[PDB]
Amino acid sequence: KTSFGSLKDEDRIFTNLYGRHDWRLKGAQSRGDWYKTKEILLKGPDWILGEVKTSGLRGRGGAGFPTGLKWSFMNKPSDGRPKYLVVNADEGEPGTCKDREIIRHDPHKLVEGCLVGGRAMGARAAYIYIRGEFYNEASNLQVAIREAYEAGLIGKNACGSGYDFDVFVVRGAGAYICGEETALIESIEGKQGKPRLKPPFPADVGVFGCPTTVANVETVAVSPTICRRGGAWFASFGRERNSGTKLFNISGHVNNPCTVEEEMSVPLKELIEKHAGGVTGGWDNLLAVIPGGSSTPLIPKSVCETVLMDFDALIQAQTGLGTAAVIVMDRSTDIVKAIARLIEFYKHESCGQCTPCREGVDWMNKVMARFVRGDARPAEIDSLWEISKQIEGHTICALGDGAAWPVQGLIRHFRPELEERMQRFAQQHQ
Amino acid sequence: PFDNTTYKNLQHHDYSTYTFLDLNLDLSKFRMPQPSSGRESPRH
Amino acid sequence: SNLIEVFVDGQSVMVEPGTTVLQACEKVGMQIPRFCYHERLSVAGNCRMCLVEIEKAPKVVAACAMPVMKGWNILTNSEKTKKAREGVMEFLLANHPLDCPICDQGGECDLQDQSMMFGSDRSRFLEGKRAVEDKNIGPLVKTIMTRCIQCTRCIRFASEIAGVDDLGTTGRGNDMQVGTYIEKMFMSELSGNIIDICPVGALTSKPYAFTARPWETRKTESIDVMDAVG
Amino acid sequence: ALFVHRDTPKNNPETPFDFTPENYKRIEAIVKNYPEGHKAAAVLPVLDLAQRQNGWLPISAMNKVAEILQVPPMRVYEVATFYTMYNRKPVGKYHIQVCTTTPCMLRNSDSILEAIQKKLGIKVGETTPDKLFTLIEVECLGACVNAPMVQINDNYYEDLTPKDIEEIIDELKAGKIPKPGPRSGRFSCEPAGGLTSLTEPPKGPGFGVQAGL
Numbered sequence: 011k012t013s014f015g016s017l018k019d020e021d022r023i024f025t026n027l028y029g030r031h032d033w034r035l036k037g038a039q040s041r042g043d044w045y046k047t048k049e050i051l052l053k054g055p056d057w058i059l060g061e062v063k064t065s066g067l068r069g070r071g072g073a074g075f076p077t078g079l080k081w082s083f084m085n086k087p088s089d090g091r092p093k094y095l096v097v098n099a100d101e102g103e104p105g106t107c108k109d110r111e112i113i114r115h116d117p118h119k120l121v122e123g124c125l126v127g128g129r130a131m132g133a134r135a136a137y138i139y140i141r142g143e144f145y146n147e148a149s150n151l152q153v154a155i156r157e158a159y160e161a162g163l164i165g166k167n168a169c170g171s172g173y174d175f176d177v178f179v180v181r182g183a184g185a186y187i188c189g190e191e192t193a194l195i196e197s198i199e200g201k202q203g204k205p206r207l208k209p210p211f212p213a214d215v216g217v218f219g220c221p222t223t224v225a226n227v228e229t230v231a232v233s234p235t236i237c238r239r240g241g242a243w244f245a246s247f248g249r250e251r252n253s254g255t256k257l258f259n260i261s262g263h264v265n266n267p268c269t270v271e272e273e274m275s276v277p278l279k280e281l282i283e284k285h286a287g288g289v290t291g292g293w294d295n296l297l298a299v300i301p302g303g304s305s306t307p308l309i310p311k312s313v314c315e316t317v318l319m320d321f322d323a324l325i326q327a328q329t330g331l332g333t334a335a336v337i338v339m340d341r342s343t344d345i346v347k348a349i350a351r352l353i354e355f356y357k358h359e360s361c362g363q364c365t366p367c368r369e370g371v372d373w374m375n376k377v378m379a380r381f382v383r384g385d386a387r388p389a390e391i392d393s394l395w396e397i398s399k400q401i402e403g404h405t406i407c408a409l410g411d412g413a414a415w416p417v418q419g420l421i422r423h424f425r426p427e428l429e430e431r432m433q434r435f436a437q438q439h440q
Numbered sequence: 441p442f443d444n445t446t447y448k449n450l451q452h453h454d455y456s457t458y459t460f461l462d463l464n465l466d467l468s469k470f471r472m473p474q475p476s477s478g479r480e481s482p483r484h
Numbered sequence: 485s486n487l488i489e490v491f492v493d494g495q496s497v498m499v500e501p502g503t504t505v506l507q508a509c510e511k512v513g514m515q516i517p518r519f520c521y522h523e524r525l526s527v528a529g530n531c532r533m534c535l536v537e538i539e540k541a542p543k544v545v546a547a548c549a550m551p552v553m554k555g556w557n558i559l560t561n562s563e564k565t566k567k568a569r570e571g572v573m574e575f576l577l578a579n580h581p582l583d584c585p586i587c588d589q590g591g592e593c594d595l596q597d598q599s600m601m602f603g604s605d606r607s608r609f610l611e612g613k614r615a616v617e618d619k620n621i622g623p624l625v626k627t628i629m630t631r632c633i634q635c636t637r638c639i640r641f642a643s644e645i646a647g648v649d650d651l652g653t654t655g656r657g658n659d660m661q662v663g664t665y666i667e668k669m670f671m672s673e674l675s676g677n678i679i680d681i682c683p684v685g686a687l688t689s690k691p692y693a694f695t696a697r698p699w700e701t702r703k704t705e706s707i708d709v710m711d712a713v714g
Numbered sequence: 715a716l717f718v719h720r721d722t723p724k725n726n727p728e729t730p731f732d733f734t735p736e737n738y739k740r741i742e743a744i745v746k747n748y749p750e751g752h753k754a755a756a757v758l759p760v761l762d763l764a765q766r767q768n769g770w771l772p773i774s775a776m777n778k779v780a781e782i783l784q785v786p787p788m789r790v791y792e793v794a795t796f797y798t799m800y801n802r803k804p805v806g807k808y809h810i811q812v813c814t815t816t817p818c819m820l821r822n823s824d825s826i827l828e829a830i831q832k833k834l835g836i837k838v839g840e841t842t843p844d845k846l847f848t849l850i851e852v853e854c855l856g857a858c859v860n861a862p863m864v865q866i867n868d869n870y871y872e873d874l875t876p877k878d879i880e881e882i883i884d885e886l887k888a889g890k891i892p893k894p895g896p897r898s899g900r901f902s903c904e905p906a907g908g909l910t911s912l913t914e915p916p917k918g919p920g921f922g923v924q925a926g927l
C-alpha cells in the first residue's frame with residue numbers, strides 16, 4: 011500500500027477504549043476476549059513465538075526492539091530458578107496516557123496478554139507494576155483479576171490447560187525513573203529505583219535474580235489478538251519493519267486532544283486534522299511538534315508536513331517515534347520556556363546513580379533558566395551542545411539521552427530565536 | 441441493544457482508601473505457594 | 485584451560501572467562517582510571533571514569549563491570565575514550581567545592597591526580613555549585629559531605645565488609661546525600677578504614693586532621709602489635 | 715525538601731504508632747504475595763499501608779516496617795526518601811497536587827494555580843491554618859490529553875477551569891467528596907466534538923480467527 015492511515019473500525023484491536031462498554035468480564039467476553047485461549051496455551055511456546063515473529067510486532071515501550079527476538083531470548087531450559095514476565099505500567103512519560111486507558115477500560119485484554127506471554131516463555135507468574143497515583147486504575151485491574159481468578163481463567167489449571175499461572179499487581183510510589191525496566195526490577199525487589207548495567211541482561215538475571223522479561227502494556231495486550239487473528243493480518247498494516255497499529259495521544263494546543271488507534275504509517279498532519287480537529291488558528295499557526303514525548307527532539311512545521319509517524323521515517327527525520335505522543339505548540343508559545351520546563355521535569359525526576367546525568371541535567375537546567383531569562387552569550391550555545399554530547403552515550407540508562415535530545419533538537423531547529431533573545435536582552439539591560 | 445452514549449465505568453466513585461489492599465487480601469486465597477530461595481533472607 | 489584471547493591496543497593476551505575489561509588492561513599493564521570500582525568491594529559502576537572504547541562498536545563500555553569477549557580490541561587511548569574521560573571530569577568537578585587548600589586529602593587526592601592526568605585544564609561551569617550540609621558519625625571521622633561525589637564506597641563497605649548496614653543514600657538527583665538520615669553514631673571495629681577508601685576529602689581522620697601533609701612525610705614499614713593478627 | 719531528620723517533639727522515634735489488626739492481616743497478605751526469602755520486596759507496599767493509616771510518615775513506621783520485615787532501618791529510610799509519594803511531614807486532610815509539565819503548561823495550568831492562591835490564600839508548599847488543604851506542585855500524572863488537571867488524595871480532576879476548581883474547593887469545604895472524572899463535555903478521553911471512531915458496534919467473538927487455532 012502507498013497511502014496509509016484511516017484504520018477501519020472493525021480492525022481496531024482496542025475496542026471500548028473510550029469506556030463506552032462494560033469493563034468487567036461480561037463486557038470483555040462479548041467483544042471477543044478469552045476466545046479459544048486454551049488452544050493458544052496448548053499449541054506451544056514455539057508456535058506462539060512464531061506467530062509473534064510473523065506479525066513483525068516491535069517494542070511499543072519507546073525503543074522499538076523486535077518483540078519476537080526479545081520474547082525468544084527466554085526459549086531456554088530452566089536452571090532451577092523460576093521465570094517471570096513483568097508488565098510495565100508506570101506511565102511517567104509526559105504526553106502519554108494510553109496505557110492508563112487500556113488498564114482502566116480493557117483490563118481483561120491485559121490479563122489475557124499476561125497469560126499468553128507467560129505461557130510463551132514458560133514464566134511461572136506475572137507481575138504488573140502500576141503507578142502509585144493510579145489508584146482507581148489499579149483497583150479496576152484488581153477487580154478484573156479477581157473476576158478472572160474466580161471464573162477459573164487463571165490460577166490452578168489456567169483456562170483448562172494444565173499450565174498454572176499467577177497474575178500479581180505491585181503498586182509504585184510515584185517515580186518516573188521507575189519506568190525503566192531495570193529500575194523497575196530493582197523497585198519490585200524493595201530497593202531504590204536505580205537501574206542496573208547491561209550485561210547482565212534481564213533475560214539472564216532479572217527480578218529476584220530469576221530470568222525476567224519486561225514488556226509494555228499495549229505490546230502485551232495486542233498479543234492475544236495477534237495469536238487469534240493471525241500474523242499476516244497484523245503484518246499487513248504499515249510499511250515493512252514498521253507493522254502494526256498504534257495508540258496516538260494528541261495533546262497540546264489542539265481543539266480536541268484525544269487518544270486514537272491508527273495505522274502505523276499515518277502522516278502527522280493527516281492524523282492531527284482527522285482525529286484531533288487541527289491546530290488552533292489553522293494549520294499554518296503550527297510552530298513545533300514533539301512527536302513522541304520528552305524522549306525525542308521536536309520538529310518544525312517545514313518537516314512536519316510530509317513526515318510519517320513510524321520508527322524508521324522519524325529516525326530518518328533526526329528524531330524518534332518513542333511513545334507516539336504528539337505534543338503540539340502553536341506560534342503563541344515560548345518554546346524556550348517549554349524546553350526549560352521539560353529539563354526541569356528531568357531534573358526533578360532523575361535517580362542520580364551515575365554521575366553524567368546527575369550533574370549535566372542540573373547544568374542544563376541552569377543553562378535553560380539563563381536562556382529563558384536571556385542572560386546568555388551566543389558562544390555559550392554551542393558549548394551547551396557539547397554538554398549534551400557528554401551526556402548522550404555515557405549513562406547507565408537512557409534518561410540521559412532523553413534529556414540531551416530535546417535540547418539538541420531545540421538548538422538545531424530554533425537557534426535564531428535563542429540568538430535573538432540573548433541579543434535583545436544584551437541590548438536592553440546593558 | 442447497542443449503547444455508546446453513557447460512561448459505563450462509574451465504579452471508581454465507590455472506592456475507599458483501602459480498596460486495593462483489601463482486594464489483594466481477598467485475592468490471596470486463589471494464589472499458589474511461592475517458590476523458595478533456600479534461605480530465610482540474604483542476610484540470614 | 486579455557487582462557488580466551490582478547491586484544492589490548494593490538495596486543496594479544498589470554499584471560500579466564502569472566503575477566504573484566506579493567507582486569508585485562510591491568511594484566512597487559514595499563515591501570516584504567518576509576519573512582520567507584522574497588523578490587524575488594526562489589527562492583528557499582530556509577531562514576532563512568534572507566535569508560536573505554538572497544539573497536540568496531542559505536543558505544544563506550546564501562547571497563548569496571550563489562551566482561552570481555554573473544555577477539556575484543558580494547559582501544560584504551562583513542563579519541564572518544566579521552567573525550568569521555570574529559571567529560572566525566574568536567575561533570576565531576578562541576579559541583580566540587582574549591583576546598584583544596586583547607587583539605588586534608590591535598591597531595592594524596594585521587595580527584596586532583598586524575599583531573600591533571602586525564603581531565604581538562606579549565607572550567608566551563610559559570611553557575612553556582614551545590615552545598616550539602618555536614619553531618620557527624622563520631623569522633624573518628626571528620627565529616628564534610630560538601631566534597632562527596634556519591635561514589636558509593638561507603639555503603640558497600642558498611643554493608644559487605646563492616647556488616648553494619650547504617651550508611652545509605654537519601655534523596656533523588658542532585659540533592660542526594662550519602663548519610664544515615666538520623667543522628668546515628670557510625671561506630672564499628674573497622675570504621676576508620678572508610679577514611680582509606682574515600683577518593684576525595686569528604687571523610688577525614690579527625691585526630692590527624694589539619695596536622696600534616698603527605699609530601700612532607702617519611703614512610704616506614706612496620707608491624708602492628710596491638711593484637712595477635714600481626 | 716530536606717533529606718535529613720531532626721529529633722522533633724512531634725516526630726521522634728518514641729512517638730506511639732502501631733498497625734491495626736486488619737492492617738496486620740493485609741501486611742501478612744502482602745508478605746505472602748512475594749516469594750520466600752525476599753520479604754524486603756514488601757518494603758514498598760507495606761510502608762504505603764502505613765501512610766494510609768496516618769496520612770503522613772513519622773519516624774516510627776519506618777522502624778516498625780524494619781521490625782516486621784527484619785530489614786535494616788536504613789533501607790526503609792532510603793525507600794521513604796527516594797520516592798515522593800511518602801509524606802514525611804504532616805500534610806492536610808486534602809492533598810492538592812497540580813500538574814505543570816509541558817503538555818499541561820501549554821493548556822494554561824497557571825490560571826488554575828492562580829485560582830488556588832487567590833481562593834485559599836496559601837503559597838506552594840504552605841498549609842492552611844485548619845490543616846485541611848496542602849498545595850504542592852507535581853510533575854506529569856498521566857492525564858495529558860485531559861490537560862489541565864489536578865489530583866486530590868487518590869482522585870483525578872481533569873479538564874478544569876478556575877470557576878470549576880473553585881467550586882470543587884467549596885464542595886470539599888462542605889465535606890462532600892466530588893466526582894473523580896473530567897469536568898468538560900467528554901467522559902474519559904474521547905474528543906469533545908463527537909466521536910472520531912469506535913461508533914460501530916463491537917463484532918463479538920470469533921471475528922476472523924485464523925484457521926487451525
Ligand SMILES: NC(=O)C1=CN([C@@H]2O[C@H](COP(=O)(O)OP(=O)(O)OC[C@H]3O[C@@H](n4cnc5c(N)ncnc54)[C@H](O)[C@@H]3O)[C@@H](O)[C@H]2O)C=CC1
Pocket residue numbers: 069070071072073074075080083101102103106189191211212213305306330332333408412
Ligand atoms: N514508554 C515510556 O513511557 C518511555 C519510553 N522511553 C523510551 O525508552 C527507550 C529506552 O529504553 P530501553 O528499553 O532501555 O531501550 P533499548 O536500548 O534498550 O532496548 C530495547 C529493549 O531490547 C532489550 N535488549 C537489547 N539488546 C539486548 C540484548 N543483547 N540482550 C537482551 N535484551 C536486549 C533491552 O533489554 C530492552 O528491553 C527509548 O527509546 C525512550 O524513547 C523513554 C521514556 C519513557
Ligand SMILES: Cc1cc2nc3c(=O)[nH]c(=O)nc-3n(C[C@H](O)[C@H](O)[C@H](O)COP(=O)(O)O)c2cc1C
Pocket residue numbers: 068069070071072073074075098099100101102103186187188189190191192224225226227229407408409
Ligand atoms: C527513563 C526511562 C523511562 C521509561 N519509562 C517507561 C514507561 O513508563 N513505560 C514503558 O512501557 N516503558 C518505559 N521505558 C522503556 C523500557 O525500558 C522498556 O522499553 C519497556 O519496559 C518495554 O519495552 P518493549 O516495548 O520493547 O517491550 C522507559 C525507559 C527509560 C530509559
Ligand code: SF4
Pocket residue numbers: 187204205360361362363364365367368405406407408409410
Ligand atoms: S542516566 Fe540518570 S536516571 Fe539513568 S541511571 Fe544515570 S543517574 Fe540514574
Ligand code: SF4
Pocket residue numbers: 580581582583584587588589590591593594595596631683684685686
Ligand atoms: S577532595 Fe581533592 S579535589 Fe576535592 S577539595 Fe579535597 S584535595 Fe581538592
Ligand code: SF4
Pocket residue numbers: 631632633634635636637638639662681682683684686687
Ligand atoms: S564520602 Fe567518599 S567514600 Fe563515601 S560515598 Fe562519598 S566519595 Fe565515596
Ligand code: FES
Pocket residue numbers: 517518519520521528529530531532533534535546547548549
Ligand atoms: S570505575 Fe567503572 S564506572 Fe566507576
Ligand code: FES
Pocket residue numbers: 103104105106813814815816817818819853854855856857858861863
Ligand atoms: S503533562 Fe500533566 S498529566 Fe501529563
Ligand SMILES: [K+]
Pocket residue numbers: 589678679680681682683684685686687688
Ligand atoms: K579520605
